[PDB]
Amino acid sequence: GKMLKDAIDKQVAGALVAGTTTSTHSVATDSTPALQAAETGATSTARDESMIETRTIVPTHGIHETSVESFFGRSSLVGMPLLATGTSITHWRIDFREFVQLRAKMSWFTYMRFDVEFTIIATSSTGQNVTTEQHTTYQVMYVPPGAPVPSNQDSFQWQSGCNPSVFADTDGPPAQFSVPFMSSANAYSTVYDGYARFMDTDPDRYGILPSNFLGFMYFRTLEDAAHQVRFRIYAKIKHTSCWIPRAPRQAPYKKRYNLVFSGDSDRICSNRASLTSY
Amino acid sequence: GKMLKDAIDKQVAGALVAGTTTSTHSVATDSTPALQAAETGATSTARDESMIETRTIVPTHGIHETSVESFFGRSSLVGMPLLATGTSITHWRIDFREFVQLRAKMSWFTYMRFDVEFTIIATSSTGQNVTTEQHTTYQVMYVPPGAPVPSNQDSFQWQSGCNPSVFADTDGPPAQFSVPFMSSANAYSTVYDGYARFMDTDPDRYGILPSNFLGFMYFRTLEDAAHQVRFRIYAKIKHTSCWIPRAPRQAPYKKRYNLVFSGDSDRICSNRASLTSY
Amino acid sequence: GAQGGSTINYNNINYYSHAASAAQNKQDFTQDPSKFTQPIADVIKETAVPLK
Amino acid sequence: GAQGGSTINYNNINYYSHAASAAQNKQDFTQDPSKFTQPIADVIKETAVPLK
Amino acid sequence: GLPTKPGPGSYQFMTTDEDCSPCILPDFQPTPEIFIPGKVNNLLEIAQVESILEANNREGVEGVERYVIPVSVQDALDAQIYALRLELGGSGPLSSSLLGTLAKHYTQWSGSVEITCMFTGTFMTTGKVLLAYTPPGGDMPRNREEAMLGTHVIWDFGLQSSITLVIPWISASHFRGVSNDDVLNYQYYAAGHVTIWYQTNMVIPPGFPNTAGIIMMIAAQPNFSFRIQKDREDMTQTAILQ
Amino acid sequence: GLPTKPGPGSYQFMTTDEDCSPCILPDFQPTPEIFIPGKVNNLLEIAQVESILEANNREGVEGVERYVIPVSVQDALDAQIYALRLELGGSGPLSSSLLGTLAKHYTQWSGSVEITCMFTGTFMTTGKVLLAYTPPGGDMPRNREEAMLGTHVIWDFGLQSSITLVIPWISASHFRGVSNDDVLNYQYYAAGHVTIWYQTNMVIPPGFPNTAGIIMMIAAQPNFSFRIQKDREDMTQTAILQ
Amino acid sequence: GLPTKPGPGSYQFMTTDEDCSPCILPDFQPTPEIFIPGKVNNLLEIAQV
Amino acid sequence: YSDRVAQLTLGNSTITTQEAANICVAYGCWPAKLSDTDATSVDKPTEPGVSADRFYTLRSKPWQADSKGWYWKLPDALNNTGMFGQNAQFHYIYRGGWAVHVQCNATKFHQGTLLVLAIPEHQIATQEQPAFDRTMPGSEGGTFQEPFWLEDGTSLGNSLIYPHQWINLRTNNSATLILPYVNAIPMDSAIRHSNWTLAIIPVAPLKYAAETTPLVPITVTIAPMETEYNGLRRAIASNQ
Amino acid sequence: YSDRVAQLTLGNSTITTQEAANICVAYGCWPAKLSDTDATSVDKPTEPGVSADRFYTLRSKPWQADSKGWYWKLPDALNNTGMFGQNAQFHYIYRGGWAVHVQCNATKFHQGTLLVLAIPEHQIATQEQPAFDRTMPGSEGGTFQEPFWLEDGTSLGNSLIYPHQWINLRTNNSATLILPYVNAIPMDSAIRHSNWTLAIIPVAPLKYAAETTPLVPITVTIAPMETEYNGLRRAIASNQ
Numbered sequence A, B: 001g002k003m004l005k006d007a008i009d010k011q012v013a014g015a016l017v018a019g020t021t022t023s024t025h026s027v028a029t030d031s032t033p034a035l036q037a038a039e040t041g042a043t044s045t046a047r048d049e050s051m052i053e054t055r056t057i058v059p060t061h062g063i064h065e066t067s068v069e070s071f072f073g074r075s076s077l078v079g080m081p082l083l084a085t086g087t088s089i090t091h092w093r094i095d096f097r098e099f100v101q102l103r104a105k106m107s108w109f110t111y112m113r114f115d116v117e118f119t120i121i122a123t124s125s126t127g128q129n130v131t132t133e134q135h136t137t138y139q140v141m142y143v144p145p146g147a148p149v150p151s152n153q154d155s156f157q158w159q160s161g162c163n164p165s166v167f168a169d170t171d172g173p174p175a176q177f178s179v180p181f182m183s184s185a186n187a188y189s190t191v192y193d194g195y196a197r198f199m200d201t202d203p204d205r206y207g208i209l210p211s212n213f214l215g216f217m218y219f220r221t222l223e224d225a226a227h228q229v230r231f232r233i234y235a236k237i238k239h240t241s242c243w244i245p246r247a248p249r250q251a252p253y254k255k256r257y258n259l260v261f262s263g264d265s266d267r268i269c270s271n272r273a274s275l276t277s278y
Numbered sequence C, D: 001g002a003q004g005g006s007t008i009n010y011n012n013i014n015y016y017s018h019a020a021s022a023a024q025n026k027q028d029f030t031q032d033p034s035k036f037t038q039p040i041a042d043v044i045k046e047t048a049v050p051l052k
Numbered sequence E, F: 001g002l003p004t005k006p007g008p009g010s011y012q013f014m015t016t017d018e019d020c021s022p023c024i025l026p027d028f029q030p031t032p033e034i035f036i037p038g039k040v041n042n043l044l045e046i047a048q049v050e051s052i053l054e055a056n057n058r059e060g061v062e063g064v065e066r067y068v069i070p071v072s073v074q075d076a077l078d079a080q081i082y083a084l085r086l087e088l089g090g091s092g093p094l095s096s097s098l099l100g101t102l103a104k105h106y107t108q109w110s111g112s113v114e115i116t117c118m119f120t121g122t123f124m125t126t127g128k129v130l131l132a133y134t135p136p137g138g139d140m141p142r143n144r145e146e147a148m149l150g151t152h153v154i155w156d157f158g159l160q161s162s163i164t165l166v167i168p169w170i171s172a173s174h175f176r177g178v179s180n181d182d183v184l185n186y187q188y189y190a191a192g193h194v195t196i197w198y199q200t201n202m203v204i205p206p207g208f209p210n211t212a213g214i215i216m217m218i219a220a221q222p223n224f225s226f227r228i229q230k231d232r233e234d235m236t237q238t239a240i241l242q
Numbered sequence G: 001g002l003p004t005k006p007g008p009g010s011y012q013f014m015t016t017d018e019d020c021s022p023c024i025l026p027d028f029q030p031t032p033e034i035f036i037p038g039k040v041n042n043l044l045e046i047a048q049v
Numbered sequence H, I: 001y002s003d004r005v006a007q008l009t010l011g012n013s014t015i016t017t018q019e020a021a022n023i024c025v026a027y028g029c030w031p032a033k034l035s036d037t038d039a040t041s042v043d044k045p046t047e048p049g050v051s052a053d054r055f056y057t058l059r060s061k062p063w064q065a066d067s068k069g070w071y072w073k074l075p076d077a078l079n080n081t082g083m084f085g086q087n088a089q090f091h092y093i094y095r096g097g098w099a100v101h102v103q104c105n106a107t108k109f110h111q112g113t114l115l116v117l118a119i120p121e122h123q124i125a126t127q128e129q130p131a132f133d134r135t136m137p138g139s140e141g142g143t144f145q146e147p148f149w150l151e152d153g154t155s156l157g158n159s160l161i162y163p164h165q166w167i168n169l170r171t172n173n174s175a176t177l178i179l180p181y182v183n184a185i186p187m188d189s190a191i192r193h194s195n196w197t198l199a200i201i202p203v204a205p206l207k208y209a210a211e212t213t214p215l216v217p218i219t220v221t222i223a224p225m226e227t228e229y230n231g232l233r234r235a236i237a238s239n240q
Ligand SMILES: CCCCCCCCCCCCCC(=O)O
Pocket: A094, A095, A096, A097, A116, A142, A179, A182, A188, A212, A213, A214, A217, F024
């Protein structure tokens, strides 16, 4: 049926890399492809065929593993809240900045528009952190800014009449759910050269764009936990638009909410004793 | 096939918000859009374009998250009966008034016609309420008004020849089932300015419309429970018709079966010291 | 719907017999705000004076 | 696609209502490298001298 | 049997699931739908209805009187009548209105808002009032000279009892955050100021009441919307209701 | 119910799964996409942009100066300016460039690379330089006589400040390994050598700076690609960021 | 295998379920239906007596 | 041309006002008779016509300095009045709409504002569940004690969602509301259930150009509209 | 025929250079006005035209032997200058592109190379989160302390991904960049957010054919392009 045709999108990865045309020797004063001028800011236009004698090469290699979708389109850890047994409650602030691998991958772009698939793995363990048996339901509640936060395991906030929740078992399959692009802005921002507030220039609000922050995930067990639970929160970025590539992060990350780095030794690649030998 | 076409309904959320037409300055005695009269009971008709000079704005925002279906169309807690080990039996009276979030959401309307998806999460725990292991079947029996109630775990009422029952495991996936609009009336009523009975004006039967009450859910374990079981009963309202919007509840709820409130301090929003500063 | 902008387009497929089993309806239905905003016998056009 | 060479050919089938539920997009989209490599008002053909 | 691979998310219960589920009473045939007046299909039909601002929120004012802003005969020129931070969230006067109480259920908002004011003085009582909307970036306007630089209407008391100041959607972004969540710096979404000033003065015949009132009313324009349902802050319970 | 047989891989979570999954907010309607300049659809658009080699990686050179290879007036003929092992992996100068940092995320590479050199001496400073690419099998070329036997360009300093040596894809196989993993003998994928020599000499007018610089720049050609994502070696953490 | 997501209500037994289920005697061929007087299709035929 | 001048003629009765605002027609729905598709009761209804579809005037109320407001249940307030009252007493079930007219004149030397609410299904409470003398107060009506909370734990400010007009003394001396039948069933008992509440709440207090405060009454006039009755038996006056 | 000679005329102002390289147009995108499909703010924008779309010259900088570099935030650097500055002060939100022209002449007896970066959303840090005097330095601009790390934990070598030119003294004395508006929203506040940073970093140091080092200034000239402003109120100068 055509109605089911609406739920199917045929999508194709068949873009190839550029090929090579055979070329011959050139002795002239007409064509000088090797002479360049980096001052313009343009990258060199010279190609293989104009610099040496080439054979013909039919293109066969795909480019799809470096499409922005493929590069971001896998799951990565973004949150690891620990539910202790004293209160049986925990939360994770929602952003991709606690764990460095996804953050550094995002640092190649300025603005990014995407959806998210979240995946939550819960693991129970003892005080000495050895795996242990515990079968219990847990509740993950999305708490958006301005909604009252639960303060206990039995708080009546966990009613969840308006906050969305997911209920799953600690020893069941992983909870998984998708999320549309939720920013009030038309993209997310990986970096922000401004202040979070008018009438304020506190350093702690520099580089803080609050339209990236959609709130909190809160976690309880539905009864009081017998053992601590660790939730691992994975995000896969999908349906991805990217704008304005950047110099990628090179210094290690130090803080969650700013770009501070050490910068004690100004170098990235390793040293050698002489430029004319390895 | 066309027969399977009967089981598919293509349904679309593409209603947009109103746009903006550009306007220019107006110097006249003809058109006075800013002059109003609130005495009529009509809301102001003045629009942006007639009050200031506007640009053109193409509408892009949807309205679907405030459709009545979307606003009610999620699950909320409505019942939390506890099955103790002494009798291994409990029940929940069926109405959406024990827990305040769903009740307050319903208080925006007078009459509401809907279906229900119920979801039941069972959790076992110790006397000190710490999660514990217990694998057992439980039985939820719909007991409508006039059907004899079970008095024990082994009562022969649990035969369930005519009452519908659901059997599920305490440590299995949650039981879930749907329900059509069951009122003898043509809608449910969120508020009732009348008496439950003729020839009676007892205050305890004021505001009681018994056509909202479809009876009881009764709960046993199929054997005698070793640990207490807590059932959490969630309802999602769906296929929703709503009539006659109301002033929504503002004072906290106090009782399950009437609108009594404290009303000690007559205000809702917070105070300030002066109307001409914040 | 593999996407238009703010158009969610859904094929609700009910697997059970009773219509009550079906998932929630995603249609946008007609809005008549004026039964609540302009609930008056005589229409008052925006550019007119309301009284008289 | 039971295989052409470097052509992955996929029918993304979304079972849920919201487009955000769909799996990741496998299309190759247009590449315009020259907005970054040749970001200059006057085109400089390869065989010409760049300055002047 | 058809070979399958159940994946992640198996057996979870999400409260916003949109799935069909077996009916426990598959033979039931409900009562017909009858005509009832006032069917609502979308809560933005309610948000476009005017409601009264709890505008006189001064410490010590209780009850119905919180709905009338005082307006008096002034002995000095260009005085201020009222000041209000434009906010759908928080706990100020807009928060308890129809639009404000709907905004309590939502995280984000967009669109134009209108404020309709009704004067309640005697027939013989005259006056002119300046109603100003100041876009964000600074503080509340300090004097009528500064406030007039913004969007503003000038109200003449007369036969038509009421005025509208349309607060237009003026915004860097398509949407703002409803809340003012501090830890999350949602003051980023500061939406400006509404102030009311005496444009001339309130003038009365000898021995008339030297004080009258404005009843402020607010509603959403047709270009308004809400996103992201969220729990209402002030609808709580400490126990199951009995 | 339809008879089924769930098979192996049931309930597993693979990080590269391509599956639809229920949306926790199925009624949400996002903000429109606006025009933004510089949309990127494929990271090989970035790899074709020239970036500066951290080429002066001698022990003791810090900061911006690591970006300028010294070039001097020579007192002897046919001297060597620079030597560089052609490697997208490891930790040598190519590893910190745009192409090198992208290669840190990938396991395999193919295609031609180009190196653009810009001379920074005074207008009056002259010179001719030989830039050589030696295919693998042996060591770095020891003298300009040996290096010239390979692919090479000869650069005349003049008005056009810059030159390109195209390092063409010359390879037994369609792809090479990015890394030089020793236990796995990925030195199998040795990709050759780049060396720079004085073709004549740097010559200056009396009392000019006798030392100038080359800024080396590198980028991928349009026939280039990467395979197999892999973790970046030098982007680590010992603790969760707070 | 076809990727699936079993949801809530998995493995429950509802007494009013309307589902097909495997027949323990799939080759059985019942006796024909004969005519009997007084066939009842709906209990409201009894209620009208 | 003038929505400040109105005339309302029902039966043998006619109202006029020279200072109206307009006429509020609740939910844009004029009262209408019950169609065969929504009806359930099989007996042929009695439709009394002009004998009941006419304006009835209740006793007037003084607007005092301290007044919190007044309220009337419908049909409750008219259940003992005229042929409407008799038809409502003699039948088990009733249906119909209302034409409500609130009168209050004062001077150009007065100020003050009344809010005139028609509230459907206005179930009331306070710190306690209310007794019968407040839920069904009869022709004399009741008084608010929590006008800020609209006697129901909601707020007066948000009650503009209900059909309403104002009486602002500088502008008008009368409010008119036309109310359709509202219920979740087709017909319902007149003695057991109140479909509408007429509520008149002072918002801006009543002030005079002197300190001597003459008598300013409020007067309610209500006409039933498009009435039907089913279930004829003896006459029953109240649910007690 | 000659991309070494350029003339730039905006408003009442005209720049010339006899040693340009070319003109960099960032992302191949000429500045453009906001279309009705992407716009959200409903008020009619003010477009000041030539009163603001003109070249402004900042104070010059000496290129010294030790110089690490200089930077300016935009619109920050021009927020107190001319009718651009006034339109940016008096409106809540602003949008527009830039025409940037960096001048530095020296002799055929000099050597040295400047890198001229236009960096969008250039959020900066060092071992510490920066203060306001560095995030929004004004017309005088700021200076780099970590030019190798591009003040942001990235690398200067990879910043050629950003729109750029060089000033290599043997080749050219000037760099020209045309910048489109870049943001994740349609308009944004001029005092709270800097959309672009103009960064001028010495890569090859400045050397003279003698040991006596005369003064070689760097001079920045910036023209706003295709500007709009919405949200008129009083004038607000800074985010402090
Ligand atoms: C739990 C359902 C709603 C949660 C919304 C999650 C959306 C996350 C998007 C994060 C984008 C900003 C990333 C960042 O600031 O580093």
